[PDB]
Design a protein around this motif. Sequence first.
Motif, PDB file in Angstrom:
ATOM      1  N   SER A 165       0.833  -1.192   0.000  1.00 58.93           N
ATOM      2  CA  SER A 165       0.000   0.000   0.000  1.00 58.93           C
ATOM      3  C   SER A 165       0.871   1.246   0.000  1.00 58.93           C
ATOM      4  O   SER A 165       0.761   2.089  -0.885  1.00 58.93           O
ATOM      5  N   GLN A 166       1.750   1.355   0.987  1.00 60.94           N
ATOM      6  CA  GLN A 166       2.638   2.506   1.074  1.00 60.94           C
ATOM      7  C   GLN A 166       3.225   2.796  -0.309  1.00 60.94           C
ATOM      8  O   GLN A 166       2.912   3.813  -0.922  1.00 60.94           O
ATOM      9  N   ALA A 167       4.060   1.881  -0.800  1.00 59.01           N
ATOM     10  CA  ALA A 167       4.717   2.024  -2.102  1.00 59.01           C
ATOM     11  C   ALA A 167       3.768   2.332  -3.248  1.00 59.01           C
ATOM     12  O   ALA A 167       4.110   3.113  -4.135  1.00 59.01           O
ATOM     13  N   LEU A 168       2.592   1.713  -3.251  1.00 59.38           N
ATOM     14  CA  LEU A 168       1.635   1.976  -4.314  1.00 59.38           C
ATOM     15  C   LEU A 168       1.150   3.415  -4.220  1.00 59.38           C
ATOM     16  O   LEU A 168       1.160   4.144  -5.204  1.00 59.38           O
ATOM     17  N   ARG A 169       0.727   3.831  -3.036  1.00 61.80           N
ATOM     18  CA  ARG A 169       0.250   5.195  -2.861  1.00 61.80           C
ATOM     19  C   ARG A 169       1.289   6.227  -3.298  1.00 61.80           C
ATOM     20  O   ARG A 169       0.928   7.278  -3.827  1.00 61.80           O
ATOM     21  N   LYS A 170       2.573   5.930  -3.083  1.00 59.26           N
ATOM     22  CA  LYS A 170       3.656   6.843  -3.465  1.00 59.26           C
ATOM     23  C   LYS A 170       4.089   6.677  -4.917  1.00 59.26           C
ATOM     24  O   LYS A 170       4.471   7.646  -5.572  1.00 59.26           O
ATOM     25  N   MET A 171       4.027   5.449  -5.421  1.00 58.09           N
ATOM     26  CA  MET A 171       4.425   5.179  -6.797  1.00 58.09           C
ATOM     27  C   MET A 171       3.289   5.276  -7.823  1.00 58.09           C
ATOM     28  O   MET A 171       3.545   5.307  -9.025  1.00 58.09           O
ATOM     29  N   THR A 172       2.041   5.311  -7.366  1.00 58.59           N
ATOM     30  CA  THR A 172       0.921   5.406  -8.295  1.00 58.59           C
ATOM     31  C   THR A 172       0.938   6.776  -8.910  1.00 58.59           C
ATOM     32  O   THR A 172       0.949   6.916 -10.130  1.00 58.59           O
ATOM     33  N   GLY A 173       0.934   7.790  -8.054  1.00 61.46           N
ATOM     34  CA  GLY A 173       0.952   9.151  -8.547  1.00 61.46           C
ATOM     35  C   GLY A 173       2.137   9.425  -9.460  1.00 61.46           C
ATOM     36  O   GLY A 173       2.020  10.160 -10.444  1.00 61.46           O
ATOM     37  N   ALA A 174       3.277   8.817  -9.143  1.00 61.82           N
ATOM     38  CA  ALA A 174       4.497   9.013  -9.922  1.00 61.82           C
ATOM     39  C   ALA A 174       4.475   8.682 -11.416  1.00 61.82           C
ATOM     40  O   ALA A 174       4.639   9.571 -12.250  1.00 61.82           O
ATOM     41  N   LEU A 175       4.290   7.407 -11.756  1.00 63.72           N
ATOM     42  CA  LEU A 175       4.265   6.999 -13.156  1.00 63.72           C
ATOM     43  C   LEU A 175       3.061   7.637 -13.824  1.00 63.72           C
ATOM     44  O   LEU A 175       3.035   7.801 -15.044  1.00 63.72           O
ATOM     45  N   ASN A 176       2.071   8.005 -13.016  1.00 67.05           N
ATOM     46  CA  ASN A 176       0.865   8.639 -13.529  1.00 67.05           C
ATOM     47  C   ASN A 176       1.286   9.761 -14.466  1.00 67.05           C
ATOM     48  O   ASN A 176       0.825   9.835 -15.606  1.00 67.05           O
ATOM     49  N   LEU A 194      -3.176  -3.633  -4.495  1.00 68.18           N
ATOM     50  CA  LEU A 194      -2.885  -3.633  -5.917  1.00 68.18           C
ATOM     51  C   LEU A 194      -4.192  -3.824  -6.669  1.00 68.18           C
ATOM     52  O   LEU A 194      -4.384  -3.272  -7.747  1.00 68.18           O
ATOM     53  N   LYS A 195      -5.094  -4.605  -6.084  1.00 66.53           N
ATOM     54  CA  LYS A 195      -6.395  -4.856  -6.692  1.00 66.53           C
ATOM     55  C   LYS A 195      -7.210  -3.581  -6.741  1.00 66.53           C
ATOM     56  O   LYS A 195      -8.195  -3.489  -7.465  1.00 66.53           O
ATOM     57  N   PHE A 196      -6.803  -2.592  -5.960  1.00 61.88           N
ATOM     58  CA  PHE A 196      -7.531  -1.338  -5.934  1.00 61.88           C
ATOM     59  C   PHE A 196      -6.738  -0.224  -6.576  1.00 61.88           C
ATOM     60  O   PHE A 196      -7.274   0.847  -6.838  1.00 61.88           O
ATOM     61  N   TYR A 197      -5.464  -0.484  -6.846  1.00 62.73           N
ATOM     62  CA  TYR A 197      -4.616   0.524  -7.466  1.00 62.73           C
ATOM     63  C   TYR A 197      -4.477   0.310  -8.953  1.00 62.73           C
ATOM     64  O   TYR A 197      -4.234   1.255  -9.703  1.00 62.73           O
TER      65      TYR A 197
END
Length: 307
Positions: A165-176, A194-197
């Motif tokens: 979760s942590q990494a996704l929340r920080k890395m989702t916005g990034a590659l976005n 991940l199922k929600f990201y």
Amino acid sequence: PDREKALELAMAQIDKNFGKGSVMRLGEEVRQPISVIPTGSISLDVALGIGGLPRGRVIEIYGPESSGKTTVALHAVANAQAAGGIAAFIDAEHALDPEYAKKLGVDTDSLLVSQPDTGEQALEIADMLVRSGALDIIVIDSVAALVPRAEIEGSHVGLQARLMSQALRKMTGALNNSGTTAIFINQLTGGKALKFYASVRLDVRRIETLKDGTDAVGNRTRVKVVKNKVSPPFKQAEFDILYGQGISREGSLIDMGVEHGFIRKSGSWFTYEGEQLGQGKENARKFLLENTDVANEIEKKIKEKLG
């Protein structure tokens, strides 16, 4: 206060409140934006609706073992590279075969591979690599192998559940805003985030076994795109994956060729407009494997009947 009128007024309100397609109509043939990496499976391609994995979006390809999940994610790397793209493989399973890869189109030589030692290191050297805005696509093998710092030393404390979760929340916005599509790989935990990201989640399971009285090779793979935020969900497709050769480009042109009426099967004897190709399928795929022009028109004809 016409319903269809009232519906659209309140519906468009969400897209501007929660997102692009927070609300889709399963029928909609909406197509705009693009910038997609063909997966090499014309079938799966349209299945996605935008003809490829949306770039700059986090994607998940789950399935059991020997399903072909990696094969697809690799075909993705070949293409992304084949178009001047920089690929990054965050290995945590150590199963990757270069020989199988290079034979699919991947420029192994110029392929960033990294073998983290912890879940945190893997999702760091990866989120870091994502921000360098140099990569186009980056695949992390095995969401499972991404075991926490501890559990490696001595469950109880912070587990992957948050690690992801942590990494996704920080890395989702990034590659976005980086235009770097992110492929995760699951394997029927942290996959509860991940199922929600994921903006696209693919379900790859092996169905049957192409074969010829021979000792088998590949296997008709079926893919159900259960979660799609670019185009409408629940579509599916199938494609052949020859042993040690990859996804059958030509073989896919047939299944799609006869499905859209461009080819006929008179007595299990295929034919593309007057000129027959051969009997059986594997014999028709062998034909298209030779003269590319003919297969080229076909591919050129299906690319029009649909985007």
